[PDB]
Write a protein that binds this ligand. Sequence first.
Ligand SMILES: Nc1ncnc2c1ncn2[C@@H]1O[C@H](COP(=O)(O)O)[C@@H](O)[C@H]1O
Ligand SMILES: Nc1ncnc2c1ncn2[C@@H]1O[C@H](COP(=O)(O)O)[C@@H](O)[C@H]1O
Ligand SMILES: [Mg+2]
Ligand SMILES: [Mg+2]
Lengths: 247, 247
Amino acid sequence: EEHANMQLQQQAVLGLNWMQDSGEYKALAYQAYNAAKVAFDHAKVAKGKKKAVVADLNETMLDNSPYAGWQVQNNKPFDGKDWTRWVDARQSRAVPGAVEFNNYVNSHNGKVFYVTNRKDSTEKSGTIDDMKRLGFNGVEESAFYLKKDKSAKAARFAEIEKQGYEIVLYVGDNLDDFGNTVYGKLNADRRAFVDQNQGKFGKTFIMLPNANYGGWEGGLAEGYFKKDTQGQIKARLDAVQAWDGKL
Amino acid sequence: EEHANMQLQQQAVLGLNWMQDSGEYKALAYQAYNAAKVAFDHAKVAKGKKKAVVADLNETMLDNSPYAGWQVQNNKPFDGKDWTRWVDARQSRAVPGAVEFNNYVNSHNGKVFYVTNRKDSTEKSGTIDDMKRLGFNGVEESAFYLKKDKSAKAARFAEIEKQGYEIVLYVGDNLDDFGNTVYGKLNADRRAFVDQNQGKFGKTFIMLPNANYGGWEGGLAEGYFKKDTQGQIKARLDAVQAWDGKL
Ligand SMILES: Nc1ncnc2c1ncn2[C@@H]1O[C@H](COP(=O)(O)O)[C@@H](O)[C@H]1O
Ligand SMILES: Nc1ncnc2c1ncn2[C@@H]1O[C@H](COP(=O)(O)O)[C@@H](O)[C@H]1O
Ligand SMILES: [Mg+2]
Ligand SMILES: [Mg+2]
């Protein structure tokens, strides 16, 4: 139903306004990247290791909010085929602070590797073109670990380590950017992971804000991503914790 | 129109799910408070000054998300009279990391002052009761600078300084928690303020995420808060930046 598609996408509007328009969102991005630089400068690695930083791309270093805007305007639930066209459109923006941090790491005895679920086979060319245009240094193909057969990222982290790197910090907007332990899990387990790692945030796990999509969306209900539009609407509304209006 | 009230509040749903349910939101809160502790420990003040930390309350140290949930369920635009009842309900929660940071400052030669737009005359009793219950130390009345006649906060910051304190850092979810220079201004000016202070974030200005309300909402359009429901809906949708769907 077009009506359901409309309601589902309307639910994203206020968070999208916040991400696209607010100074507060920018401040959170700068806060993250300022903290990331401190962590990078402090980091020491094992003898014989090279210093690596692992960075997510979407909503961490690259800003895809215009795709979300298109979803709102056209009542379009997420579809990977539309996403591929968005990537090919080569209109990605940079998250504030990301280029400066990236280029600083790469010029100060580190290497940023991009571990991202943009698709290696169909989305790599647009990604690399946009990143060059946006001012990122170090965007030769070998810096990229785009999605091949698995959305979970831990195996790609391991590939980087096998190449003689020690990963000194991770940057992401999704907890699945820090490992696999809550991949595909519901939000209670994901909150628990965060509590179990409280001291790492702003140090070795650097968070960017994303109120629009992610593992937390699937985390709203068992089988969320396989539900139809009406089911996803219901899952979102059922997750709401509300005051009963009483004292 | 009930229909417009419904649409307006539906637009908050996804961001509310993110704030209420996601581990990512918790991680951002921990990141902020971890950074705040580092900044506090590093801070040195002028000879003869006492160390103060200024903290916002709502969506910085106190979590009022159930009020937002009630808005969604009842199609209720924000109303200060409803807000006062929410405060009186004494069901506020704590933002993750806030109590620990607060109590650490207060036991390590600092004092946290709460500069907040909860209302001094009608909302103070519930605020203090909730904070005691939530585990905050240092919540005697004199630690509080609740709203009296002005929503802008700079004058209250000045009161704190007049009492012999040097403010070493500010914690907030709203740029207006850092001063008055973009109070009542639109989002372009607010983004500019952030760019002009890029290096302060995560150091002397500590940001918490709030995708649900704030100065950025009013910042969406001239006279936003005076518009009717339909006008606010239009302002939000008009602010959306969308991909045109082309290459
Ligand atoms: N709104 C959305 N809902 C679900 N998946 C999305 C959405 N937007 C993007 N994606 C996918 O998630 C990936 C995230 O990539 P990254 O954050 O770099 O790992 C994208 O490349 C898309 O395949
Ligand atoms: N959704 C909302 N829209 C506008 N104002 C709000 C909303 N929720 C709360 N407020 C007001 O903003 C104040 C924020 O307080 P604080 O963040 O502590 O300065 C609250 O005490 C309310 O008076
Ligand atoms: Mg991402
Ligand atoms: Mg606040």
